[PDB]
Amino acid sequence: PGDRLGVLTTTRRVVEQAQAVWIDHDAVAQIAEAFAARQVTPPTWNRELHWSDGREALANYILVLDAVNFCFWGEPRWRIEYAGAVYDGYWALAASLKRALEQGVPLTDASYLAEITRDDVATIFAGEGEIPLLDERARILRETGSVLAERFAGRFSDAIAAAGRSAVALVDIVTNAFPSFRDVATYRGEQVRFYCRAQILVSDLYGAFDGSDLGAFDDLGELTAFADYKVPQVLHHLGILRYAPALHDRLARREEIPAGSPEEVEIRAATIWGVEELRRALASRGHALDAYQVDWLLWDEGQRLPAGTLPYHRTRTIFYLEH
Numbered sequence: 001p002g003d004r005l006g007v008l009t010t011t012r013r014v015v016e017q018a019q020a021v022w023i024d025h026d027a028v029a030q031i032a033e034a035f036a037a038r039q040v041t042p043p044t045w046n047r048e049l050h051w052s053d054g055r056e057a058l059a060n061y062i063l064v065l066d067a068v069n070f071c072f073w074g075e076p077r078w079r080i081e082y083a084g085a086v087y088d089g090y091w092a093l094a095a096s097l098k099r100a101l102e103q104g105v106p107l108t109d110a111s112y113l114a115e116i117t118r119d120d121v122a123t124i125f126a127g128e129g130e131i132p133l134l135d136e137r138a139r140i141l142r143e144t145g146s147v148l149a150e151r152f153a154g155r156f157s158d159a160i161a162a163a164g165r166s167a168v169a170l171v172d173i174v175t176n177a178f179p180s181f182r183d184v185a186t187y188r189g190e191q192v193r194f195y196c197r198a199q200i201l202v203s204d205l206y207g208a209f210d211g212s213d214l215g216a217f218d219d220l221g222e223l224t225a226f227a228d229y230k231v232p233q234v235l236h237h238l239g240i241l242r243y244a245p246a247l248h249d250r251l252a253r254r255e256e257i258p259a260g261s262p263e264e265v266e267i268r269a270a271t272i273w274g275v276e277e278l279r280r281a282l283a284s285r286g287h288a289l290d291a292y293q294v295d296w297l298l299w300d301e302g303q304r305l306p307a308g309t310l311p312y313h314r315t316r317t318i319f320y321l322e323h
């Protein structure tokens, strides 16, 4: 199997044992048949709302972007004005960085990031309501800058160069060096490995560089889905993920689910395998996509679900460590 990060191997043990979540392989077959019938294809890379520049500064942009790419929910809803449009969620994040960099804030400079304060980021992300975990995003941007400065001469380009066109080796280099990116958990006393933000970071570089230079990777097939909260919401909507009663009610009542709890780990593990079972079934029906592509394609559908879909699971992302 390969699986040199062990995301598939460890998460497969969760899916086999899982009590609150299961895959409906009949629904997988139906959806594969339909997505393959209209030979569907993923979004390219939405380079309207992503900042653009030279090799060194752009590679740093991607690392910063995915360093604070998490948890956008809470009331009142966090919205952002940018260039005549109002944005929320992940698109509010990317617009907020484009705006800032365009107003001349050096978010690609290690020295600036290492020193960046609560006040700075409060303003970078200012708008309707406030971005969740404002302080934690400040700490992570400081942590990101210091590591860039010390270990990679302020250039994420150096870290990427070291990977040698291996997506899998880059994720390893990232999690080894940047504590914020260490996305693992336990389930019934076993380590489960996810590497959500670390893995998406690799996919974003492939997008931003059109699979050339710093975005060149020979093993993108090895990436898994990026297990957060939108893709499972879509897989449930498509009938591929089923939730048992107590968990279905929590999600419907918009009750927060403690991070690293069995129910939370079950949803993320099932999201990885939900996407993988869909990739295999699409491949069987003559439509070969990589796992990250099926994830990109599903996250895409998540932007336009009908109102009255089961709400996404709400987890206060934790990393309150590195002391």
Ligand SMILES: Nc1nc2c(c(CN[C@H]3C=C[C@H](O)[C@@H]3O)cn2[C@@H]2O[C@H](CO)[C@@H](O)[C@H]2O)c(=O)[nH]1
Pocket: 043, 044, 045, 046, 069, 070, 071, 090, 196, 197, 200, 207, 225, 226, 227, 228, 229, 230, 231, 295, 296, 297, 299, 300
């Ligand atoms: N799993 C997953 N997550 C995605 C995305 C995206 C956007 N991906 C773009 C990349 C290529 C296409 O243009 C897609 O629109 C943001 N995010 C955000 O990244 C985090 C990890 O899921 C969450 O905060 C999401 O809101 C995705 O495709 N898959």
